From a paper:
Upon illumination, the excitation energy is sequentially transferred from the chlorosome BChls through a monolayered baseplate, Fenna-Matthews-Olson (FMO) complexes, and ultimately to a membrane-embedded RC, where charge separation occurs. Because only one gene encodes two copies of the GsbRC core proteins (PscA subunit), the GsbRC has a homodimeric architecture with a symmetric distribution of pigments, suggesting two identical branches of electron transport chains (ETC) that could be equally utilized. Two membrane-associated PscC subunits (cytochrome cz or cyt c551) contain the cytochrome c domain, which mediates electron transfer from the menaquinol/cytochrome c oxidoreductase to the P84026–29. On the cytoplasmic surface, PscB binds two FeS clusters (FA and FB), serving as terminal electron acceptors.
However, our RC-FMO2 structure reveals the association of two FMO trimers, two PscC subunits, two accessory membrane subunits, and additional pigment molecules. In the RC-FMO2 supercomplex, the orientation of the two FMO trimers does not follow the symmetry of the PscA dimer, and each associate with the RC through a unique binding interface. The residues that contact FMO2 are more distant than those contacting FMO1, and the effective areas that contact FMO2 are much smaller than those for FMO1, resulting in a larger solvent-excluded surface for FMO1 with the membrane RC (624.0 Å2) than that for FMO2 (247.1 Å2). A BChl pigment (BChl-A816) and a monogalactosyl diglyceride (MGDG) lipid are located between PscF and PscA1. Therefore, this identified BChl is very likely to serve as a linker bacteriochlorophyll to mediate exciton transfer from FMO1 to the RC. This linker BChl is not found at the FMO2 and PscA2 interface, and the spaces between PscA2, PscC, PscE, and FMO2 are filled with lipid molecules, leaving no space for additional BChls. The linker pigment was identified along the FMO1-PscA1 axis, but not the FMO2-PscA2 axis, and this could result in a higher energy transfer efficiency in the FMO1-PscA1 pathway than the FMO2-PscA2. Also, when the RC-FMO2 structure is compared to the RC-FMO1 or the previous cryo-EM structure, a loop of PscD (Q83-P108) exhibits a slight conformational change in the presence of the second FMO trimer. Compared to the RC-FMO1 structure presented here or the previous cryo-EM structure, the RC-FMO2 structure has revealed additional pigments: one BChl a (located at the interface between FMO1 and PscA1), one F39 (located near the PscA dimer interface), and one F26 (located in the PscA2). In the RC-FMO2 supercomplex, the binding of PscB and PscD with the two FMO trimers leaves one side in the cytoplasmic space available for ferredoxin docking, and the size of this open space is sufficient for the entry of one ferredoxin molecule.
Numbering used by the authors:
A (entry chain V): 7 to 366
B (entry chain A): 62 to 708
C (entry chain F): 3 to 52
D (entry chain D): 20 to 120
E (entry chain B): 3 to 16, 130 to 229
The structure:
């Protein structure tokens, strides 16, 4: 009875032609205990994208994370207006709210993110068809306004302004505060390092309700290539490929008994052009793998995995490493064997390739 | 012919298909059991003897389900026993087909509770899986090997219980009775239990399989089971001829077998089937009702060795075909992984060690050189023995290889060691080498051959009949074509097997011929057993009795028709047939329109070269071995009285 | 001394050092002309290594 | 082990000269692409070393936007046999689709 | 602790412009059969002495409809059947196997010595 097994069922239903729109249906469970020092940890995530204006590239993305962890009904909602300006700059108007137990507070931000690669050499991109590791830096300039409606909000504002005006290492220890718990151990495990922030301003002004605290700060996410927020900067924002609303409804309930994960999404960018007429199920982001490896190495598990890639009619998978167990004339199925070994590889922190090159 | 491909089916579908086929096979077994009922339980006369039941009557009487006793009494009891066991097989096969339908449709919902079990996760039989497996094979065939070993251990145990109680054969160590088969049934339980546990706790690894390998694992296990069949055929031949099996196989000769199609009591033309029917005409042999199938003694027919030969050759033909099919399906998998590029990514000796084309060429060259050497040696020996016995070029039998017995260290394998056994062994090695040329070509030269990598060509479609007349001709170069050539080459080793087991003198083509010294082999070689006539005269001697049977004659004609029909598709005629079929279509069109106003709009179909080769090899094998069945079903006809010198 | 005796019982085990083709040939030689022919094979190859 | 890496019909990996443009006037616009079709490379000196060593096999199609005839070094004493340099040799694949029905 | 959300995961169980290189075609015709019957862009051109390889394959680009049946079939044995992508790159196959640096792994003591 004391057997640790990781059951799973992934499904990728693609759309034909240039459309990269894919439907991801992932069920999973494992009787291994979670790594949360507070249990049980249950969470739901709703991530809905609507193209607000195709001409200006503005896409309204709404993210609602609800969670209960040791009986704490946390809930973070955020609605942003992400929009490219250049190939290396994005703007994001947005609003949002965060509620923990009884406490709650809103925010409204006007952020701007500039992702600059450390090199744009033509040799690398003309020699490597699949450039995974692209070192770079990502400068975030965030202007966030919070209405100070609660006693705790004003107390925190006072404490933070006192710390900035009195402590000379706030810009450096803010990372220690901010990457709570193992997060600081994660940025070092993914090749990331966050530079000292540049708090350009802390002010408070009258607003529609009362005193609103405005913070203008800057930081820089530094990726060594393994970071998907840098190497895949254009790949992770397919607004150009976004024609209809996209959805991602996920959730995980993780008690001492085990973890159960359910995900249902439909969104673009699942299939990217690999050249030679071969579309490819996109390169797997490496940050999820190397970050989940900080928890997946804690118990030996028997993998029971099944990946069902439902190709559009007419398309065939020419390469599959590991190879597809079965095929219902469009529904290629990976189950057991080298696929199970790869599922163990990536469930424990591996970043190995799983090539799926399909073409018509 | 590809509808049930491995890729098209998943593991549960295969489980269900095998289960439903086991049920169908149990129905077939019940049919054979009922066919074996010589006297019905109600008293009336029963079915005649069929080869389908004369093949299993030895085993059935071994288990006491059948009886060699000849009185109507206790033969009625044997018939009732056979009916009961056939009904058991029928019902269990119904249940097996139900399970097979459920697995094929994946509707594994209990009809009582409705709980839908999971093929991926399922406790076996309830608590036993918890005690032993602790949870199923989450995935993987490697984790399934141990569970299957435990299942086979339970099968062995169940057979032990059944024979101990139901069939009344207690477990006794002595290996001269069926009792040991009970004893060992328990032994092989523990073994196949313990090993299973081991393979459950310590799984084995051959990473080529386990991944996308229903075809790959199927190929390996089909080759393995083909060698299992060959070993079973050899074991059956040896054991069924041993004294311990004589009560069940040698006592066939004491019985008289009324077989369907055998000579029937003939009647004059002026015959009327009324009452006694004597006044109108005269039946051939009196005391038997007109048109009745006349008795045939097993002593003359040699039914002991006939049934032994039928079983042995069944297993040998099935095993050789399974080896060839396993190599072919493994070649299909090899070609698939070569096309998709996994070939170089396999990290196992079964693929890596032959990755180099140099080693493949050296392997096939060694096989070809050994085949040339052995074939040349055996054929020179045989043709020289024929030159001597026929006294051609002034020769005489004294110059033949009568001295070339198997060495004293190898005469244990052979009852009467002579040049016949030497030629048998070396012909078997040579035929194995010949078929291995094609099997190795499938194994290695599946996607590219050294000629083709030099010629700048690659084998992609695994069934393409050719690439055209380029380079003088590219006929029959797919792995499917090599499989067909392997089958047509193993035809000869399989023949040698048939002719050896049916008593032929394969060391010379003309043994027993009434010419020169052909009948002197028994004196010069000092043979004890009088071997059936030689390779060319064996046809004649066996057809003395094939021709005496209407049924065997019908088989002869039909198999010969089937065989020669194969050339219409195997010969380089496909284009001629296509042109002629266009002419046929036009002829039908205009002839019909003139003769009948209705238009045709139909074309005569012509097989593609791939389908042509498929059907041609099927017909070639079918005719050849439907006739080998006549060779093995005429009778052994090898007596233990050597023929004196011709002079 | 272990290699040669293992060879006289298991010649292909002795030629295991040699290429897979040689190992297969020695196995076939065990199958046909067991010991004398295959013992000849192993002694030839091992003495050649010397 | 060499026949099973890449296409089995090309012992030396083949590189078609797909695109070349006279506008840049340097002929660096020559853009070699392997038969696999995933690397739009350029005729660098390392590619020259590979070509002379025989590891690769540069080829030219006839049906295309003309690469460079007499503008990329050409030998016309016989039928044209284009060369990146006299020691190099770009064997032109011939493609007769227009001349024949 | 006990307060939770709820969820159920039933996992446990409990443009193209295809061409033919006349230099390399062997005239097998495995691509002709794939061409749609009415299109029939692919045709046979004969020089002489069929056994000497005179017969060859040609795609009439006017007749071709970029249906990809000829090339996607993976039927060309010689690699003559090529696809020129809209930007331009010659594809001799739907997917060529990756290039590898190979060596025979012979172990030291146990399995394949030397
Ligand atoms: C996570 C790794 C990086 C990071 C990388 C990025 C990337 C990449 C982007 C931003 C962008 C933004 N960043 Mg940031 N950023 C990080 C840390 C921060 C922190 C912080 C306190 O930690 C803050 C305040 C911000 C601030 C902001 C905003 C100003 C801005 C818009 C966010 C928005 O869309 O949110 C709404 C909230 C969500 C979308 C919630 C879910 C977030 C996850 C990561 C998205 C997963 C997508 C999923 C795999 C695919 C689902 C398909 C769905 C249909 C969408 N960043 C760290 C250091 N940041 C964006 C931009 O350029 O702004 C101009 C942008 O594209
Ligand atoms: C020396 C090793 C690296 C490299 C190391 C860095 C580092 C480190 C940094 C830059 C920075 C920059 N480099 Mg650089 N850079 C490389 C090669 C290149 C190539 C190229 C032809 O591939 C390009 C286009 C650039 C261009 C640039 C800009 C993206 C940026 C300019 C900042 C500024 O204000 O001025 N570098 C080489 C290969 N470069 C800076 C930047 O803004 O980083 C985000 C920076 O700090
Ligand atoms: C503010 C954050 C950024 C951003 C950050 C990232 C990052 C970082 C990554 C992506 C990735 C992807 N994003 Mg994004 N993404 C943004 C906006 C979008 C929009 C859009 C037009 O609004 C779309 C359609 C997408 C779509 C996509 C896909 C192309 C791609 C995942 C492919 C895959 O198969 O997913 C399969 C998806 C699933 C398996 C389901 C995953 C479900 C969960 C709920 C989403 C991740 C949540 C994360 C673990 C927790 C976030 C907590 C934060 C602290 C708030 N993103 C915003 C602007 N996106 C990834 C990718 O593959 O890059 C190449 C990647 O690395
Ligand atoms: C003949 C020489 C070889 C052989 C050569 C081939 C070739 C060549 C091919 C296969 C193919 C297949 N073979 Mg095979 N294979 C052999 C032995 C076997 C054995 C075995 C007995 O152990 C098995 C299980 C298989 C299994 C299989 C499948 C993996 C696959 C698809 C079969 C199916 O769907 O066909 C559907 C048709 C069948 C069910 C078989 C035909 C029999 C009919 C349906 C039986 C009932 C009617 C009646 C009794 C007999 C027929 C004649 C009557 C006049 C109607 N082969 C024999 C010994 N095999 C094909 C495949 O796709 O490969 C990838 C393929 O091309
Ligand atoms: C004895 C152990 C043998 C073996 C004996 C057989 C035989 C015998 C047959 C199969 C059949 C099949 N085998 Mg098997 N099989 C073995 C091991 C395997 C393994 C594995 C190791 O995991 C795999 C993946 C397979 C794969 C498969 C499938 C291709 C197929 C079952 C699907 C099904 O029934 O379709 C659904 C199809 C139906 C139920 C229709 C069946 C129609 C008729 C009644 C049978 C058709 C084939 C032919 C007449 C049988 C000829 C036997 C000859 C007399 C020698 N075999 C070993 C090697 N297997 C069957 C198949 O379909 O063959 C083509 C089949 O007959
Ligand atoms: C002859 C009957 C057939 C068959 C017909 C059925 C039928 C009918 C049903 C299933 C159901 C199930 N089958 Mg089944 N199935 C067969 C063999 C298999 C094999 C195998 C060992 O290779 C596998 C992997 C499975 C898989 C499964 C499970 C997913 C599921 C049971 C869940 C579990 O917890 O049940 C615990 C027990 C099991 C794992 C069953 C194992 C198979 C046994 C041998 C069935 C015997 C049935 C027979 C009438 C009773 C005779 C018992 C005597 C002791 C011999 N079956 C046998 C050989 N299978 C059942 C279901 O859905 O359960 C909820 C169900 O009702
Ligand atoms: C020995 C036990 C099994 C066996 C188990 C396996 C396994 C396991 C695999 C194969 C695989 C294959 N088998 Mg097999 N196979 C056997 C019998 C055969 C016979 C035959 C007529 O005897 C043939 C021709 C084949 C043919 C083939 C090919 C279709 C394929 C390998 C292709 C390749 O590249 O090989 C490259 C060439 C070689 C590796 C040559 C060297 C041989 C290896 C090292 C082992 C045997 C030699 C041994 C050391 C000899 C000396 C001692 C003696 C044992 C006394 N098998 C028997 C029945 N076979 C593979 C495949 O892909 O299946 C679909 C696979 O996974
Ligand atoms: C019984 C054996 C044979 C036939 C029966 C026959 C019949 C036949 N053949 Mg054949 N054939 C060989 C055997 C037989 N070929 C051999 C061993 C070779 C090796 C060289 C060979 C070779 C070629 C080439 C190269 C070409 C052809 C053709 C061509 C036909 C198309 C029209 C025609 O000829 O009608 C004239 C022929 C007849 C109509 C024959 C009359 C029927 C009969 C009395 C009884 C049929 C019995 C039956 C076959 C048994 C089972 C049936 C049922 C119970 C399941 C056509 C009907 C070609 C054409 O299409 O052009 C004309 C062509 O080009 N062949
Ligand atoms: C290893 C060496 C290979 C040679 C194999 C020995 C053959 C001699 C033999 O029959 O054994 C000799 C033994 C007994 O040899 C004696 O022979 C006598 C005939 O003179 C009678 O048969 C006696 O009963 C028997 O004792 O015979 C058998 O075991 C016959 C069973 C079938 C054996 C052949 C199966 C081989 C299958 C390969 C088919 C190739 C297809 C391609
Ligand atoms: C086991 C194998 C399973 C099945 C394969 C077995 C199989 O396919 O057979 C093999 C072969 C059929 O191959 P073909 O592709 O050439 O068949 C074309 C047919 O339409 C005959 O032209 O048969 C023969 O040619 C001999 C028997 C034909 C005899 C039939 C006569 C047809 C008469 C047609 C009308 C003639 C009149 C002329 C009018 C002008
Ligand atoms: S004779 Fe027939 S099989 Fe041979 S190459 Fe020509 S078309 Fe192909
Ligand atoms: Ca006989």
């Amino acid at each position: 009875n004391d057997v640790t097994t990781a059951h799973s069922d992934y499904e990728i239903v693609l759309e034909g032609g240039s459309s990269s729109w894919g439907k991801v249906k992932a069920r999973a469970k494992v009787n291994a205990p979670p790594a949360s020092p507070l249990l049980p940890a249950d969470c739901d995530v709703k991530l809905n994208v609507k193209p607000l204006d195709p001409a200006k590239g503005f896409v309204r993305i709404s993210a609602v994370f609800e969670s209960i962890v040791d009986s704490t009904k946390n809930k973070l909602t955020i609605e942003a207006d992400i929009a490219n300006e250049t190939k290396e700059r994005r703007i994001s108007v947005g609003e949002g709210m965060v509620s923990v137990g009884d406490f709650s507070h809103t925010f409204s931000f006007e952020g701007s993110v500039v992702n600059l690669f450390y090199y744009r050499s033509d040799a690398v991109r003309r020699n490597v068809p699949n450039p995974i590791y692209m070192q770079g830096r990502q400068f975030h300039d965030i202007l966030m306004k919070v209405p100070l409606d609660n006693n705790d909000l004003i107390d925190t504002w006072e404490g933070t302004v006192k710390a900035i005006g009195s402590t000379g290492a706030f810009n450096d220890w803010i990372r220690d505060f901010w990457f709570i718990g193992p997060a600081f151990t994660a940025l070092n495990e993914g090749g990331q390092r966050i530079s000292r922030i540049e708090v350009n301003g802390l002010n408070t002004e009258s607003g529609p309700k009362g005193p609103v605290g405005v913070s203008r700060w800057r930081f820089s996410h530094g990726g060594s290539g393994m970071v998907d927020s840098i190497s895949r900067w254009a790949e992770l924002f397919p607004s150009d490929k976004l024609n209809r609303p996209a959805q991602v409804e996920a959730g995980f309930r993780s008690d001492s008994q085990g973890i159960e994960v359910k995900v249902d999404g439909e969104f673009p960018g699942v299939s990217v052009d690999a050249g030679g007429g071969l579309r490819r199920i996109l390169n797997h982001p490496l940050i999820p793998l190397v970050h989940h490896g900080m928890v997946g190495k804690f118990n030996n598990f028997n993998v029971d995995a099944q990946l069902k890639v439902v190709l559009p009619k007419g398309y065939k998978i020419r390469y599959a490493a590991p190879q597809y167990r079965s095929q219902n004339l469009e529904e290629y199925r990976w189950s057991g064997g080298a696929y199970a070994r790869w599922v163990e590889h990536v469930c424990k922190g591996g970043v190995g390739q799983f090539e799926i090159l399909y073409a018509q | 012919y590809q509808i049930f491909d491995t890729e098209k089916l998943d593991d549960e579908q295969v489980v269900g298909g095998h289960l439903a086929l086991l049920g169908v096979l149990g129905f077939i077994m019940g049919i054979y059991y009922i066919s074996g009922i010589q006297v019905f339980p109600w008293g009336a006369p029963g079915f005649h003897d069929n080869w389908f039941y004369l093949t299993i009557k030895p085993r059935m009487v071994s288990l006491g389900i059948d009886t060699y006793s000849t009185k109507t009494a206790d033969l009625e009891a044997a018939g009732a026993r056979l009916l009961g066991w056939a009904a058991f097989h029928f019902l269990v096969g119904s249940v097996l087909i139900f399970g097979g339908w459920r697995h094929w449709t994946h509707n594994l919902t209990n009809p009582f509770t409705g709980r839908c079990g999971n093929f991926r996760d399922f406790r076996f039989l309830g608590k036993f899986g918890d005690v032993v497996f602790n949870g199923t094979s989450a995935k993987s065939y490697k984790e399934a090997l141990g569970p299957h070993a435990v299942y086979m251990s339970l099968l062995f145990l169940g057979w032990g219980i059944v024979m101990w109680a139901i069939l009344g054969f207690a477990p006794i160590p002595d290996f001269q009775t069926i009792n040991s088969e009970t004893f060992m049934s328990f032994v092989f339980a523990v073994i196949f239990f313990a090993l299973g546990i081991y393979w459950w706790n310590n799984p084995p690894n051959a990473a080529i399989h386990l991944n996308d390998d229903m075809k790959a694992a199927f190929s390996v296990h089909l080759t393995a089971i083909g060698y299992i069949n060959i070993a079973l055929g050899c074991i059956a031949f040896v054991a069924f001829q041993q004294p311990s099996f004589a009560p069940y196989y040698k006592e066939l000769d004491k019985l008289v077998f009324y077989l369907y199609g055998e000579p029937f009591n003939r009647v004059s033309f002026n015959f009327v089937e009324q009452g006694g029917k004597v006044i109108s005409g005269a039946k051939e042999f009196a005391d038997f009702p007109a048109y009745a199938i006349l008795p045939k003694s097993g002593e003359a027919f040699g039914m002991a060795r006939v049934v032994t030969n039928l079983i042995v050759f069944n297993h040998i033909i099935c095993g050789v075909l399974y080896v060839f099919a396993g190599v072919y399906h493994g070649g299909q998998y090899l070609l698939k992984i070569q096309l998709n590029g996994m070939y170089n990514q396999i990290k196992s000796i079964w693929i890596t060690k032959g990755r180099d084309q140099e080693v493949q060429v050296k392997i096939l060259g060694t096989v070809m050189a050994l085949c040339f050497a052995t074939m040349l040696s055996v054929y020179a020996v045989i043709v020289w023995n024929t030159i001597c016995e026929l006294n051609i070029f002034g020769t005489n039998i004294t110059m033949s290889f009568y001295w070339l017995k198997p060495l004293p260290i190898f005469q244990w394998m052979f009852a009467d060691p002579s040049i016949n056994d030497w030629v048998m062994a070396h012909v078997i090695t040579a035929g194995s080498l010949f078929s291995l040329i094609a099997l190795v070509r499938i194994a290695f030269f599946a996607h590219t051959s050294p000629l083709w990598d030099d010629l700048g060509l690659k084998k992609n479609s695994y069934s393409f009949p050719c690439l055209g007349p380029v380079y003088g001709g590219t006929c029959g170069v797919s792995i499917q074509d090599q499989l067909w050539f392997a089958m047509l080459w193993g035809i000869k080793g399989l023949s040698a097997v048939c002719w050896y087991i049916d008593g032929a003198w394969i060391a010379s083509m003309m043994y027993g011929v009434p010419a020169a010294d052909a009948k002197a082999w028994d004196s010069i070689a000092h043979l004890h057993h009088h071997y059936t006539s030689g390779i060319f005269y064996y046809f004649w001697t066996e057809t003395v009795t094939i021709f005496s049977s209407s049924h065997l004659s019908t088989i002869l004609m039909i198999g010969h028709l089937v065989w020669f029909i194969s050339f219409a598709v195997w010969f380089e005629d496909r284009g001629s047939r296509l042109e002629g079929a266009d002419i046929q279509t036009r002829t039908i069109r205009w002839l019909g329109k003139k003769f009948l106003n209705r238009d045709v709009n139909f074309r005569f179909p012509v097989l593609t070269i791939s389908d042509s080769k498929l059907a041609g090899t099927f017909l070639y094998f079918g005719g050849t071995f439907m006739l080998v069945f006549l060779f093995l079903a005429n009778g052994f006809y090898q007596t233990n009285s050597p023929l004196p010198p011709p002079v | 001394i272990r290699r040669l005796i293992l060879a006289f019982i298991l010649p292909p085990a002795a030629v295991m050092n040699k290429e897979a083709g040689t190992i297969m040939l020695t196995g076939i030689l065990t199958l046909w002309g067991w010991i004398p022919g295959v013992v000849a094979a192993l002694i030839m190859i091992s003495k050649e290594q010397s | 082990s060499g026949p099973w890496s890449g296409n089995a019909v090309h012992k030396a990996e083949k590189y078609f000269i797909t695109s070349a443009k006279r506008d840049r006037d340097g002929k660096l616009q020559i853009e070699l692409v392997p038969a696999s079709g995933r690397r739009k490379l350029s005729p660098t000196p390392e590619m020259i070393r590979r070509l002379i060593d025989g590891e690769i096999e540069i080829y030219i199609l006839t049906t295309q936007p003309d690469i460079a005839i007499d503008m990329n070094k050409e030998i016309i004493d016989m039928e044209n046999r284009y060369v990146i340099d006299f020691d190099k040799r770009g064997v032109k694949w011939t493609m007769r689709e227009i001349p024949v029905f | 602790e006990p307060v939770e959300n709820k969820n159920q995961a039933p996992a446990p169980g409990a443009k193209k412009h295809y061409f033919i290189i006349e230099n390399l075609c062997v005239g097998c015709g495995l691509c002709l059969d794939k061409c749609p019957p009415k299109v029939n862009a692919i045709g046979y051109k004969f020089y002489g002495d069929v056994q000497e390889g005179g017969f060859r394959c040609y795609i009439d680009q006017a007749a071709c409809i970029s249906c990809s049946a000829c090339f996607s079939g993976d039927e060309c044995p010689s690699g003559a059947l090529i696809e020129v992508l809209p930007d331009g790159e010659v594809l001799d196959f739907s997917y060529t196997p990756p290039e590898r640096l190979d060596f025979d792994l012979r172990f030291l003591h146990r399995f394949h010595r030397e």
